[PDB]
Design a protein around this ligand. Structure first.
Ligand SMILES: [Zn+2]
Ligand SMILES: [Zn+2]
Length: 438
Protein backbone atom coordinates (compact mmCIF):
# COMPACT_ATOMS: atom_id res chain seq x y z
CA UNK A 1 0.00 0.00 0.00
CA UNK A 2 1.47 3.25 -1.21
CA UNK A 3 -1.11 4.74 1.18
CA UNK A 4 0.88 3.69 4.26
CA UNK A 5 4.28 4.30 2.64
CA UNK A 6 3.41 7.86 1.63
CA UNK A 7 2.42 8.77 5.20
CA UNK A 8 5.03 6.69 7.04
CA UNK A 9 7.73 8.88 8.59
CA UNK A 10 10.21 5.98 8.86
CA UNK A 11 10.66 3.30 6.19
CA UNK A 12 12.32 -0.09 6.63
CA UNK A 13 14.24 0.13 3.35
CA UNK A 14 14.90 -3.62 3.26
CA UNK A 15 11.23 -4.52 3.87
CA UNK A 16 10.19 -2.62 0.75
CA UNK A 17 8.87 -4.68 -2.14
CA UNK A 18 10.83 -4.27 -5.39
CA UNK A 19 7.64 -2.80 -6.87
CA UNK A 20 7.26 -0.52 -3.85
CA UNK A 21 10.88 0.57 -4.17
CA UNK A 22 9.99 1.41 -7.78
CA UNK A 23 6.87 3.40 -6.88
CA UNK A 24 8.68 5.32 -4.14
CA UNK A 25 11.63 6.19 -6.39
CA UNK A 26 9.21 7.47 -9.03
CA UNK A 27 7.32 9.55 -6.46
CA UNK A 28 10.62 11.00 -5.23
CA UNK A 29 11.66 11.80 -8.80
CA UNK A 30 8.38 13.71 -9.14
CA UNK A 31 9.08 15.51 -5.85
CA UNK A 32 12.45 16.63 -7.22
CA UNK A 33 10.66 18.76 -9.86
CA UNK A 34 9.71 20.93 -6.87
CA UNK A 35 13.18 20.98 -5.17
CA UNK A 36 12.45 18.14 -2.70
CA UNK A 37 15.05 15.38 -2.29
CA UNK A 38 16.02 12.45 -0.13
CA UNK A 39 18.62 13.78 2.30
CA UNK A 40 21.82 11.74 2.15
CA UNK A 41 22.62 10.53 5.66
CA UNK A 42 25.79 10.44 7.76
CA UNK A 43 25.28 7.11 9.58
CA UNK A 44 22.10 5.57 8.13
CA UNK A 45 20.13 2.92 10.05
CA UNK A 46 16.77 3.62 8.36
CA UNK A 47 17.18 6.56 10.70
CA UNK A 48 15.31 9.75 11.48
CA UNK A 49 15.41 11.98 8.45
CA UNK A 50 13.70 11.75 5.07
CA UNK A 51 13.35 14.82 2.85
CA UNK A 52 14.94 18.22 2.35
CA UNK A 53 13.36 21.05 0.37
CA UNK A 54 16.36 22.88 -1.09
CA UNK A 55 14.21 25.91 -1.91
CA UNK A 56 12.93 26.52 1.62
CA UNK A 57 15.79 24.61 3.30
CA UNK A 58 13.03 22.77 5.17
CA UNK A 59 13.01 19.24 6.55
CA UNK A 60 9.93 17.30 5.44
CA UNK A 61 9.04 13.99 7.07
CA UNK A 62 7.10 12.05 4.41
CA UNK A 63 5.79 12.06 0.85
CA UNK A 64 2.30 13.36 1.66
CA UNK A 65 3.94 16.10 3.71
CA UNK A 66 6.12 17.03 0.74
CA UNK A 67 3.04 17.40 -1.45
CA UNK A 68 1.33 19.51 1.22
CA UNK A 69 4.47 21.65 1.54
CA UNK A 70 4.80 22.31 -2.21
CA UNK A 71 1.41 24.05 -2.10
CA UNK A 72 1.83 25.86 1.24
CA UNK A 73 2.84 29.43 2.09
CA UNK A 74 6.62 29.19 2.54
CA UNK A 75 7.21 27.27 -0.70
CA UNK A 76 4.92 29.52 -2.75
CA UNK A 77 6.58 32.67 -1.38
CA UNK A 78 10.04 31.31 -2.15
CA UNK A 79 9.04 30.31 -5.69
CA UNK A 80 7.85 33.89 -6.17
CA UNK A 81 10.96 35.57 -4.72
CA UNK A 82 13.15 33.35 -6.91
CA UNK A 83 11.11 34.38 -9.95
CA UNK A 84 11.29 38.09 -9.07
CA UNK A 85 15.04 37.81 -8.56
CA UNK A 86 15.51 36.11 -11.93
CA UNK A 87 13.52 38.93 -13.53
CA UNK A 88 15.57 41.63 -11.76
CA UNK A 89 18.78 39.87 -12.78
CA UNK A 90 17.84 39.34 -16.44
CA UNK A 91 16.89 42.99 -17.01
CA UNK A 92 18.25 44.31 -20.31
CA UNK A 93 20.78 47.13 -20.00
CA UNK A 94 19.26 50.62 -20.05
CA UNK A 95 19.16 52.61 -23.26
CA UNK A 96 21.19 55.82 -23.69
CA UNK A 97 17.95 57.83 -23.65
CA UNK A 98 16.76 56.26 -20.42
CA UNK A 99 20.17 56.85 -18.85
CA UNK A 100 20.10 60.51 -19.90
CA UNK A 101 16.56 60.94 -18.57
CA UNK A 102 17.63 59.52 -15.20
CA UNK A 103 20.78 61.69 -15.15
CA UNK A 104 18.85 64.92 -15.76
CA UNK A 105 16.18 63.92 -13.25
CA UNK A 106 18.74 63.25 -10.50
CA UNK A 107 20.61 66.52 -10.99
CA UNK A 108 17.29 68.40 -11.18
CA UNK A 109 16.15 66.91 -7.86
CA UNK A 110 19.34 68.29 -6.31
CA UNK A 111 19.08 71.66 -8.09
CA UNK A 112 15.37 72.41 -7.63
CA UNK A 113 14.87 70.94 -4.17
CA UNK A 114 18.33 70.62 -2.60
CA UNK A 115 20.24 72.99 -0.35
CA UNK A 116 21.78 75.71 -2.52
CA UNK A 117 24.88 77.82 -1.86
CA UNK A 118 22.53 80.74 -1.19
CA UNK A 119 20.50 78.48 1.14
CA UNK A 120 23.70 77.68 3.03
CA UNK A 121 24.29 81.43 3.17
CA UNK A 122 20.88 81.88 4.81
CA UNK A 123 21.54 79.14 7.37
CA UNK A 124 25.04 80.43 8.21
CA UNK A 125 23.46 83.85 8.79
CA UNK A 126 20.93 82.20 11.11
CA UNK A 127 23.91 80.88 13.06
CA UNK A 128 25.61 84.30 13.11
CA UNK A 129 22.56 86.15 14.42
CA UNK A 130 21.79 83.45 16.98
CA UNK A 131 25.40 83.54 18.18
CA UNK A 132 25.06 87.29 18.63
CA UNK A 133 22.00 86.57 20.77
CA UNK A 134 23.51 83.76 22.87
CA UNK A 135 27.02 85.12 23.52
CA UNK A 136 25.72 88.47 24.81
CA UNK A 137 24.29 86.45 27.68
CA UNK A 138 27.00 83.79 27.82
CA UNK A 139 30.30 84.82 26.22
CA UNK A 140 32.50 81.72 26.62
CA UNK A 141 30.43 79.58 24.26
CA UNK A 142 30.57 79.47 20.47
CA UNK A 143 28.09 78.34 17.82
CA UNK A 144 28.48 76.37 14.63
CA UNK A 145 26.37 74.75 11.93
CA UNK A 146 26.30 71.01 11.34
CA UNK A 147 24.21 68.32 9.68
CA UNK A 148 22.46 68.63 6.35
CA UNK A 149 22.84 72.43 6.09
CA UNK A 150 26.50 71.72 5.35
CA UNK A 151 26.35 68.23 3.82
CA UNK A 152 23.45 69.09 1.47
CA UNK A 153 22.11 65.57 2.24
CA UNK A 154 18.60 66.92 2.87
CA UNK A 155 16.24 69.22 0.97
CA UNK A 156 15.70 72.99 1.00
CA UNK A 157 13.20 72.71 3.85
CA UNK A 158 15.24 70.61 6.27
CA UNK A 159 16.04 71.66 9.82
CA UNK A 160 19.03 73.79 10.78
CA UNK A 161 21.36 71.93 13.15
CA UNK A 162 23.30 74.26 15.46
CA UNK A 163 25.79 73.04 18.08
CA UNK A 164 27.03 75.04 21.08
CA UNK A 165 30.65 74.61 22.17
CA UNK A 166 31.05 75.33 25.89
CA UNK A 167 33.83 75.03 28.49
CA UNK A 168 34.01 72.01 30.82
CA UNK A 169 33.28 74.02 33.99
CA UNK A 170 29.77 74.54 32.60
CA UNK A 171 26.92 72.07 32.96
CA UNK A 172 25.12 70.80 29.85
CA UNK A 173 21.48 70.52 31.11
CA UNK A 174 21.78 73.92 32.80
CA UNK A 175 23.26 75.27 29.57
CA UNK A 176 20.32 74.14 27.45
CA UNK A 177 17.78 75.43 30.01
CA UNK A 178 19.43 78.86 29.93
CA UNK A 179 19.48 78.81 26.12
CA UNK A 180 15.79 77.87 26.16
CA UNK A 181 14.98 80.94 28.24
CA UNK A 182 17.18 83.16 26.06
CA UNK A 183 15.58 82.14 22.78
CA UNK A 184 12.08 82.34 24.30
CA UNK A 185 12.68 85.96 25.29
CA UNK A 186 14.22 87.00 21.94
CA UNK A 187 11.92 88.22 19.16
CA UNK A 188 13.96 86.71 16.30
CA UNK A 189 12.25 83.35 16.87
CA UNK A 190 8.86 81.74 17.46
CA UNK A 191 7.68 78.32 18.65
CA UNK A 192 10.63 77.98 21.03
CA UNK A 193 10.30 74.64 22.77
CA UNK A 194 12.55 72.13 24.50
CA UNK A 195 13.05 68.68 22.96
CA UNK A 196 15.09 67.04 25.72
CA UNK A 197 13.82 63.48 25.37
CA UNK A 198 14.98 63.18 21.74
CA UNK A 199 18.04 61.04 21.01
CA UNK A 200 20.06 64.27 21.00
CA UNK A 201 18.78 66.83 23.49
CA UNK A 202 17.97 70.07 21.80
CA UNK A 203 16.16 73.38 21.89
CA UNK A 204 13.81 73.91 18.99
CA UNK A 205 12.85 77.25 17.52
CA UNK A 206 11.62 78.68 14.23
CA UNK A 207 13.68 81.45 12.67
CA UNK A 208 10.99 83.96 11.78
CA UNK A 209 13.00 85.58 8.97
CA UNK A 210 13.67 82.39 6.98
CA UNK A 211 10.86 80.25 8.39
CA UNK A 212 13.35 77.45 9.05
CA UNK A 213 13.24 75.18 12.09
CA UNK A 214 16.40 75.11 14.19
CA UNK A 215 17.57 72.37 16.52
CA UNK A 216 20.15 73.61 18.99
CA UNK A 217 22.35 71.02 20.69
CA UNK A 218 25.36 71.39 22.96
CA UNK A 219 28.68 69.56 22.83
CA UNK A 220 27.71 67.38 19.85
CA UNK A 221 31.30 67.16 18.63
CA UNK A 222 30.99 63.79 16.89
CA UNK A 223 28.17 65.01 14.67
CA UNK A 224 30.29 68.01 13.66
CA UNK A 225 33.27 65.81 12.75
CA UNK A 226 30.91 63.65 10.70
CA UNK A 227 29.42 66.70 9.00
CA UNK A 228 32.84 68.07 8.04
CA UNK A 229 34.02 64.76 6.58
CA UNK A 230 30.87 64.33 4.50
CA UNK A 231 30.82 68.01 3.46
CA UNK A 232 34.40 67.77 2.21
CA UNK A 233 33.66 64.56 0.31
CA UNK A 234 30.60 66.18 -1.28
CA UNK A 235 32.67 69.20 -2.31
CA UNK A 236 35.36 67.01 -3.88
CA UNK A 237 33.04 64.55 -5.68
CA UNK A 238 30.00 66.15 -7.39
CA UNK A 239 27.96 62.91 -7.59
CA UNK A 240 27.86 62.30 -3.82
CA UNK A 241 25.11 64.80 -2.95
CA UNK A 242 22.61 64.03 -5.77
CA UNK A 243 23.03 60.28 -5.24
CA UNK A 244 22.37 60.70 -1.51
CA UNK A 245 19.29 62.81 -2.23
CA UNK A 246 17.95 60.31 -4.78
CA UNK A 247 18.66 57.34 -2.52
CA UNK A 248 16.91 58.96 0.40
CA UNK A 249 13.88 60.53 -1.28
CA UNK A 250 13.25 58.73 -4.58
CA UNK A 251 13.59 55.28 -2.99
CA UNK A 252 11.30 56.72 -0.27
CA UNK A 253 13.69 55.94 2.58
CA UNK A 254 12.57 59.28 4.05
CA UNK A 255 9.47 57.36 5.24
CA UNK A 256 11.67 56.05 8.04
CA UNK A 257 12.57 59.53 9.36
CA UNK A 258 11.09 61.01 12.54
CA UNK A 259 12.08 64.12 14.45
CA UNK A 260 13.29 61.92 17.34
CA UNK A 261 15.63 60.14 14.82
CA UNK A 262 18.76 61.90 15.86
CA UNK A 263 19.28 61.80 12.09
CA UNK A 264 20.61 58.23 12.37
CA UNK A 265 18.63 56.66 9.47
CA UNK A 266 19.60 59.39 6.98
CA UNK A 267 23.19 59.12 8.22
CA UNK A 268 23.09 55.36 7.55
CA UNK A 269 21.79 55.87 4.03
CA UNK A 270 24.48 58.49 3.33
CA UNK A 271 27.10 56.02 4.53
CA UNK A 272 25.60 53.36 2.25
CA UNK A 273 25.93 55.67 -0.76
CA UNK A 274 29.53 56.48 0.22
CA UNK A 275 30.24 52.75 0.61
CA UNK A 276 28.93 52.04 -2.88
CA UNK A 277 31.08 54.85 -4.27
CA UNK A 278 34.15 53.37 -2.54
CA UNK A 279 33.30 49.81 -3.60
CA UNK A 280 32.50 50.52 -7.25
CA UNK A 281 34.93 49.32 -9.92
CA UNK A 282 36.26 51.81 -10.64
CA UNK A 283 35.63 53.73 -7.40
CA UNK A 284 34.57 57.37 -7.19
CA UNK A 285 35.52 58.00 -3.53
CA UNK A 286 38.68 56.97 -1.65
CA UNK A 287 38.81 54.95 1.52
CA UNK A 288 39.85 56.67 4.73
CA UNK A 289 42.48 54.12 5.83
CA UNK A 290 44.86 51.88 3.93
CA UNK A 291 48.32 51.13 2.62
CA UNK A 292 49.47 54.76 2.39
CA UNK A 293 49.67 54.40 6.18
CA UNK A 294 53.06 52.73 6.62
CA UNK A 295 52.53 49.71 8.84
CA UNK A 296 48.75 49.74 8.47
CA UNK A 297 47.19 46.31 9.01
CA UNK A 298 43.45 45.95 8.20
CA UNK A 299 43.15 43.75 11.25
CA UNK A 300 43.21 46.03 14.28
CA UNK A 301 41.82 48.80 12.08
CA UNK A 302 39.84 49.49 15.26
CA UNK A 303 43.01 50.86 16.87
CA UNK A 304 42.57 53.95 14.64
CA UNK A 305 40.40 56.99 15.36
CA UNK A 306 39.45 59.51 12.67
CA UNK A 307 39.79 63.22 13.47
CA UNK A 308 39.09 66.59 11.86
CA UNK A 309 39.51 67.81 8.28
CA UNK A 310 42.64 69.60 7.06
CA UNK A 311 42.86 71.76 3.89
CA UNK A 312 39.35 70.42 3.12
CA UNK A 313 41.24 67.56 1.40
CA UNK A 314 42.35 65.21 4.17
CA UNK A 315 41.00 63.54 7.27
CA UNK A 316 43.29 63.16 10.27
CA UNK A 317 43.73 59.73 11.84
CA UNK A 318 45.29 58.88 15.18
CA UNK A 319 46.55 55.51 16.43
CA UNK A 320 47.34 56.24 20.07
CA UNK A 321 47.96 52.61 21.09
CA UNK A 322 50.84 50.23 20.40
CA UNK A 323 50.84 49.12 16.77
CA UNK A 324 52.99 48.36 13.73
CA UNK A 325 52.53 51.79 12.12
CA UNK A 326 55.50 54.13 11.80
CA UNK A 327 53.44 57.14 12.90
CA UNK A 328 51.00 58.00 15.65
CA UNK A 329 48.92 60.38 13.49
CA UNK A 330 48.49 61.20 9.83
CA UNK A 331 46.03 62.32 7.20
CA UNK A 332 44.26 60.55 4.35
CA UNK A 333 43.36 62.16 1.01
CA UNK A 334 39.64 62.64 0.46
CA UNK A 335 40.07 62.81 -3.34
CA UNK A 336 40.78 60.22 -6.00
CA UNK A 337 42.75 61.17 -9.12
CA UNK A 338 39.70 62.09 -11.23
CA UNK A 339 37.29 59.11 -11.15
CA UNK A 340 36.32 60.97 -14.21
CA UNK A 341 33.29 60.27 -16.41
CA UNK A 342 30.15 58.37 -15.42
CA UNK A 343 26.62 59.74 -15.71
CA UNK A 344 24.31 60.12 -12.72
CA UNK A 345 21.72 57.84 -14.31
CA UNK A 346 24.21 55.00 -14.62
CA UNK A 347 25.43 55.53 -11.05
CA UNK A 348 21.84 55.58 -9.78
CA UNK A 349 21.00 52.25 -11.41
CA UNK A 350 24.34 50.75 -10.30
CA UNK A 351 23.66 51.85 -6.72
CA UNK A 352 20.22 50.30 -6.66
CA UNK A 353 21.63 47.13 -8.23
CA UNK A 354 24.49 46.99 -5.74
CA UNK A 355 22.10 46.92 -2.82
CA UNK A 356 19.28 44.90 -4.42
CA UNK A 357 21.22 42.10 -6.08
CA UNK A 358 24.98 42.26 -5.52
CA UNK A 359 25.89 43.03 -1.89
CA UNK A 360 25.17 40.44 0.81
CA UNK A 361 23.76 42.95 3.29
CA UNK A 362 23.03 40.33 5.96
CA UNK A 363 26.56 38.82 5.83
CA UNK A 364 28.89 41.83 5.73
CA UNK A 365 29.57 45.16 7.42
CA UNK A 366 29.11 48.41 5.52
CA UNK A 367 32.44 50.01 6.45
CA UNK A 368 33.65 53.21 4.79
CA UNK A 369 37.11 53.24 6.36
CA UNK A 370 38.79 50.42 4.41
CA UNK A 371 38.30 48.93 0.97
CA UNK A 372 38.48 45.33 2.19
CA UNK A 373 35.11 43.65 2.67
CA UNK A 374 34.40 42.97 6.35
CA UNK A 375 32.41 39.94 7.36
CA UNK A 376 30.23 40.11 10.45
CA UNK A 377 32.72 37.83 12.19
CA UNK A 378 35.60 40.17 11.27
CA UNK A 379 33.86 42.74 13.46
CA UNK A 380 32.66 40.05 15.89
CA UNK A 381 29.19 41.42 15.25
CA UNK A 382 25.98 39.38 15.12
CA UNK A 383 24.57 38.22 11.80
CA UNK A 384 21.26 39.10 10.16
CA UNK A 385 19.72 42.37 8.97
CA UNK A 386 21.77 45.53 8.42
CA UNK A 387 25.22 46.40 9.75
CA UNK A 388 26.90 49.80 9.25
CA UNK A 389 30.08 50.76 11.06
CA UNK A 390 30.05 54.37 12.23
CA UNK A 391 33.45 55.55 10.93
CA UNK A 392 33.86 57.91 13.92
CA UNK A 393 32.59 55.45 16.58
CA UNK A 394 33.84 52.13 15.27
CA UNK A 395 32.36 49.80 17.88
CA UNK A 396 28.92 51.19 17.00
CA UNK A 397 26.59 49.63 14.41
CA UNK A 398 24.62 52.76 13.48
CA UNK A 399 22.12 50.65 11.53
CA UNK A 400 20.72 49.06 14.73
CA UNK A 401 17.83 51.54 14.44
CA UNK A 402 17.05 50.14 10.98
CA UNK A 403 16.89 46.60 12.35
CA UNK A 404 13.36 46.41 13.68
CA UNK A 405 11.38 43.95 11.58
CA UNK A 406 9.28 46.76 10.07
CA UNK A 407 12.14 49.03 9.01
CA UNK A 408 14.47 46.24 7.83
CA UNK A 409 11.78 44.68 5.62
CA UNK A 410 10.85 48.15 4.37
CA UNK A 411 14.44 48.96 3.36
CA UNK A 412 14.82 45.68 1.47
CA UNK A 413 11.44 46.23 -0.20
CA UNK A 414 12.38 49.78 -1.24
CA UNK A 415 15.64 48.64 -2.83
CA UNK A 416 13.80 46.04 -4.89
CA UNK A 417 10.90 48.34 -5.79
CA UNK A 418 13.13 51.28 -6.75
CA UNK A 419 15.42 49.13 -8.90
CA UNK A 420 12.50 47.58 -10.58
CA UNK A 421 10.92 50.93 -11.18
CA UNK A 422 13.94 52.89 -12.41
CA UNK A 423 15.72 50.22 -14.44
CA UNK A 424 13.22 50.47 -17.33
CA UNK A 425 11.39 53.45 -18.89
CA UNK A 426 7.93 53.67 -17.33
CA UNK A 427 11.59 57.91 -15.55
CA UNK A 428 11.86 61.60 -14.58
CA UNK A 429 10.37 61.01 -11.15
CA UNK A 430 8.49 63.98 -9.68
CA UNK A 431 8.74 63.67 -5.92
CA UNK A 432 5.41 64.86 -4.42
CA UNK A 433 5.59 63.31 -0.97
CA UNK A 434 2.84 64.60 1.29
CA UNK A 435 4.97 65.17 4.38
CA UNK A 436 7.54 67.62 5.70
CA UNK A 437 11.18 66.79 4.98
CA UNK A 438 13.19 67.79 8.07
ZN1 LIG B 1 9.86 24.38 -0.19
ZN1 LIG C 1 9.59 61.92 1.67
Amino acid sequence: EMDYLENATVIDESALTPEQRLGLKQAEERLERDHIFRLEKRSPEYTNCRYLCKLCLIHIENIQGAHKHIKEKRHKKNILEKQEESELRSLPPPSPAHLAALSVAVIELAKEHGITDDDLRVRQEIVEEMSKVITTFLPECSLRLYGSSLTRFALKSSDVNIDIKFPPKMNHPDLLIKVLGILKKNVLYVDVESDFHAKVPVVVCRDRKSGLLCRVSAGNDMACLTTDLLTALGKIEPVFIPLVLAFRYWAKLCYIDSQTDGGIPSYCFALMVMFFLQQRKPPLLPCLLGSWIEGFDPKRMDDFQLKGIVEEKFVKWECNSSSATKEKHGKSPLALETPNRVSLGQLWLELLKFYTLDFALEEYVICVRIQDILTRENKNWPKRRIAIEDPFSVKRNVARSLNSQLVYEYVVERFRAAYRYFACPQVDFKLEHHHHHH
